[PDB]
């Protein structure tokens, strides 16, 4: 003579949602460092990310030309004129360390001690004084 | 830890670049970070 249990939440969950959303889904996370998100979704979202990046770059008032302006596909071309260094991204964030300066007529190129320049770039970016000009 | 780490044939001579490197935080003051977003 036990009355029938309704369990409106669990019933509505098991009615059409054939999964375990209304429960702790951190089994593979609390005892394993698995990838939470952005597993393969980045593949299709890369086009929209690049579009948004280009839109934000165009919207942001860039500095003068100064023979250092460059624009191409793929990402934001920092500078390619002559021997200028190249870089790209990865409010709005500001990434770095995508390429480097170019030279020729060796004497054997410079080694990775250039991190000093990268350290200064990161410090000046996190200072947020004027990223484009410096 | 055997294949490679920093640089094999990373010869001085033009390391002189170092020499000038010793100009640059000086040509211009490093900005404070303290932000690991």
């Amino acid at each position: 003579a036990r009355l029938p249990s309704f369990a409106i939440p669990y019933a509505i969950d098991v009615l059409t949602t054939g999964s375990y959303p209304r429960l702790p889904t951190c089994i593979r996370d609390k005892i394993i460092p698995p990838d939470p998100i952005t597993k393969i979704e980045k593949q299709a979202t890369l086009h929209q990310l690049n579009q948004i990046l280009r839109h934000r770059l165009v919207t942001t008032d860039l500095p003068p030309q100064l023979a250092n302006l460059t624009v191409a596909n793929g990402r934001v071309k920092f500078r390619v004129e002559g021997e200028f260094e190249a870089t790209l991204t990865v409010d709005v964030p500001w990434r770095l360390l995508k390429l480097e300066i170019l030279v020729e007529d060796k004497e054997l190129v410079h080694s990775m001690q250039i991190s000093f320049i990268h350290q200064l770039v990161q410090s000046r970016l996190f200072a947020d004084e004027k990223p484009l000009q410096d | 830890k055997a294949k490679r780490k920093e640089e094999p044939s990373s010869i001085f001579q033009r390391q002189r670049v170092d020499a000038l490197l010793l100009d640059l935080r000086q040509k211009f003051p490093p900005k404070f970070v303290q932000l690991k977003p």
């Binding site: 000093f116 | 920093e6 990373s10």
Partner: peptide
């Protein structure tokens, strides 16, 4: 690397290079 990247201090120069292989 990720971690916290709070390596402030100063220096930001040195060299971090190696090629000692010519009787010198």
């Amino acid at each position: 690397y990720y971690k916290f990247p709070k390596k402030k201090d100063v220096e930001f120069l040195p060299p971090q290079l190696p090629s000692d292989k010519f009787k010198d």
